[PDB]
Design a protein around this ligand. Sequence first.
Ligand SMILES: NC(=O)c1ccc[n+]([C@@H]2O[C@H](COP(=O)([O-])OP(=O)(O)OC[C@H]3O[C@@H](n4cnc5c(N)ncnc54)[C@H](OP(=O)(O)O)[C@@H]3O)[C@@H](O)[C@H]2O)c1
Ligand SMILES: NC(=O)c1ccc[n+]([C@@H]2O[C@H](COP(=O)([O-])OP(=O)(O)OC[C@H]3O[C@@H](n4cnc5c(N)ncnc54)[C@H](OP(=O)(O)O)[C@@H]3O)[C@@H](O)[C@H]2O)c1
Ligand SMILES: [Zn+2]
Ligand SMILES: [Zn+2]
Ligand SMILES: [Zn+2]
Ligand SMILES: [Zn+2]
Lengths: 360, 360
Amino acid sequence: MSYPEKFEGIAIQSHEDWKNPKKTKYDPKPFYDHDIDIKIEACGVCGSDIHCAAGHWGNMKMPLVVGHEIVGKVVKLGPKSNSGLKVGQRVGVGAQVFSCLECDRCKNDNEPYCTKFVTTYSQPYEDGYVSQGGYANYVRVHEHFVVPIPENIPSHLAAPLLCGGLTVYSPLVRNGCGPGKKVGIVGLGGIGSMGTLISKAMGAETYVISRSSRKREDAMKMGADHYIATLEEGDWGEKYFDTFDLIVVCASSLTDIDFNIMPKAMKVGGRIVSISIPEQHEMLSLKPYGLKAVSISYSALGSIKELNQLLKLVSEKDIKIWVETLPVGEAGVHEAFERMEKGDVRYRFTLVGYDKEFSD
Amino acid sequence: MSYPEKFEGIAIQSHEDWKNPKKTKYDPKPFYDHDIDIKIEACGVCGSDIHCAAGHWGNMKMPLVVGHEIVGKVVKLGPKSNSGLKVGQRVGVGAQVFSCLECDRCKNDNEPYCTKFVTTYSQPYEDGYVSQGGYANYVRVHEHFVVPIPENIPSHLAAPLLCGGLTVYSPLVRNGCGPGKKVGIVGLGGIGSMGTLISKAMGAETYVISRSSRKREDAMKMGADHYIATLEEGDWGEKYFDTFDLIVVCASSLTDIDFNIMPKAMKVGGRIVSISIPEQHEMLSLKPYGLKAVSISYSALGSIKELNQLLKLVSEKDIKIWVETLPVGEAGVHEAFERMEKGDVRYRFTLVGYDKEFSD
Ligand SMILES: NC(=O)c1ccc[n+]([C@@H]2O[C@H](COP(=O)([O-])OP(=O)(O)OC[C@H]3O[C@@H](n4cnc5c(N)ncnc54)[C@H](OP(=O)(O)O)[C@@H]3O)[C@@H](O)[C@H]2O)c1
Ligand SMILES: NC(=O)c1ccc[n+]([C@@H]2O[C@H](COP(=O)([O-])OP(=O)(O)OC[C@H]3O[C@@H](n4cnc5c(N)ncnc54)[C@H](OP(=O)(O)O)[C@@H]3O)[C@@H](O)[C@H]2O)c1
Ligand SMILES: [Zn+2]
Ligand SMILES: [Zn+2]
Ligand SMILES: [Zn+2]
Ligand SMILES: [Zn+2]
């Protein structure tokens, strides 16, 4: 029906026909004192959307609206709400939609690693409602995770940062990525493109690292102080031996990723940090011997504290990420859900045209 | 014959009868301007001695004197020598006997990770001589790796530190192990006992972590602020969830070591650092998923810069490690080479009685 009660968006009808989302109307999550209702106007098509919609992450309950790089307008604060959010204000939610905010971790800015963590979609809340939102009219989120968007940042250009940008940002800041450091980005995909700008933005000699040579022109436009083509090396770890401090692996999969060479190109004390979560069958397989004064580990999202620093950073030195917009609705989604599985994107797909698409 | 030319020690005759070393006389490494000749008087029986003597590390060339926790008297500096070493002075060599000292790594205190690295024994130098020393009268080492021993530190009690102590020390200091930190030591063996004292010594709430409950009394004498028995837990990672910053795995093998539970007991940003090098068949096998904001990596020896800080530290707050001396010579070695493979040691075996054993 209408906003008060029923919500509407483009939802996956089943993993089988996942490439065919349909306009749907569903029941919103029950409202709570800190919750907030945001009318969406721009969501970013993230690689994670594709995996879930497909089913690489187990069978998800359908219907199921996807999308978690949300940017919209505030349209209803909650009783005990409070944080500075004016109604009708421009905000944005990312991949985390809940946390308990009391454990040492939450209180210490590590909400992604909280025991009570709940992602923006396909996960039921402690009350049983399976999160939704993203490719729909509005989203209902707990005010702690809804952030403010600087004005000098376009909506279609901000959304991608709520997840993809934050995800690369977090391990970069946390691992000392600034003047003097040699940072390598592995996989110039969506998050890979942002990781290179953000890396440069923080003033760190950035090295983009892909397989083919196809993306050399782009990676070079982005600011990459050097590029590397895996296929044209036979063993790059030996050539770039002892060079990097940090390396962030941003790859949809982890098969065409050799983890027994990489360690060589690391400084003693270097750090290989992966961001991926592939088909629930894969594994990070690498010979143990090679982690000689070189560590490996995985990282999830980032703290809403950081999601801000990022936005602040982009806003300041004006970071122009690479986004190609689409018409929200059964069509635009399909295309995105098509071209993403073809790597056929100028890195980030940002659905827009939310307005002339749903109507009350 | 005599010191000038021929050297003498107890050498493995073959991997087969490795439990039966024999008194032997062998050709020393050619002398060089920075080299030094040290008359040994106390070597520490390290777990690595056993693996090599046995053959877990491929077939080594025999004869082969083993032992690399050496403490002795200076008996002949080299032409271009220089560093402050007085002849007849008390010094000690560890596991590294060579490095190129010019690369960024050497110049930056990471000699263990140097490309030209050479260990104290079983490795030929760039000139072809296969390092020896340890369970013998004297050892010929490049002055950069021969360190000074504080007087208030007994010889039989210092030797163990040259390798075992340094090996635990390095990752502790490098990873911030001091006031406020929760450090866990996994495997109260030789290096495990030292890791607990050194850990406490640096004022860090130390947690010894073994399988059985056998070593609770000792680990508790050492100062361990808490002990944990793997076998009496079923899943300790869940009980000690989110507790440690650092964990140093000091285990001869890596089989009875489950690496899919550990990560749970780590703080976000914690670090699991292994020190082991088992049979050349084993591997560090652990589910990839669990390294969520938790890294794993391996570490080798330590920089001679640190091998000093350690000695300084022990000397200062007087660190009494657990050593049980033995009579150098075909016998004492045998015993050590026996009890070590039975974990039948009060942690460290230090051969002594070098004097009334070889003679000129
Ligand atoms: N931990 C977190 O918080 C978090 C948050 C969001 C997403 N993720 C994960 O991030 C990934 C999606 O990132 P994205 O949206 O930026 O990616 P994407 O745009 O979907 O592109 C994937 C990129 O990874 C590389 N790639 C694809 N197939 C590969 C294969 N078989 N082997 C090696 N590399 C391959 C490609 O790089 P080149 O061809 O240039 O080498 C490609 O550009 C997913 O795995 C998702 O689950 C994690
Ligand atoms: N990287 C380096 O620089 C370096 C230098 C020297 C030595 N090392 C390595 O350090 C080890 C020797 O250390 P060490 O001399 O102190 O040891 P050790 O005295 O020989 O005792 C080994 C200890 O490890 C644990 N252990 C034995 N078998 C095990 C198994 N199957 N599974 C799990 N844990 C097991 C035991 O602890 P609990 O029974 O109490 O649990 C035991 O006390 C070797 O692996 C050697 O190659 C590395
Ligand atoms: Zn995402
Ligand atoms: Zn929490
Ligand atoms: Zn050793
Ligand atoms: Zn060097």
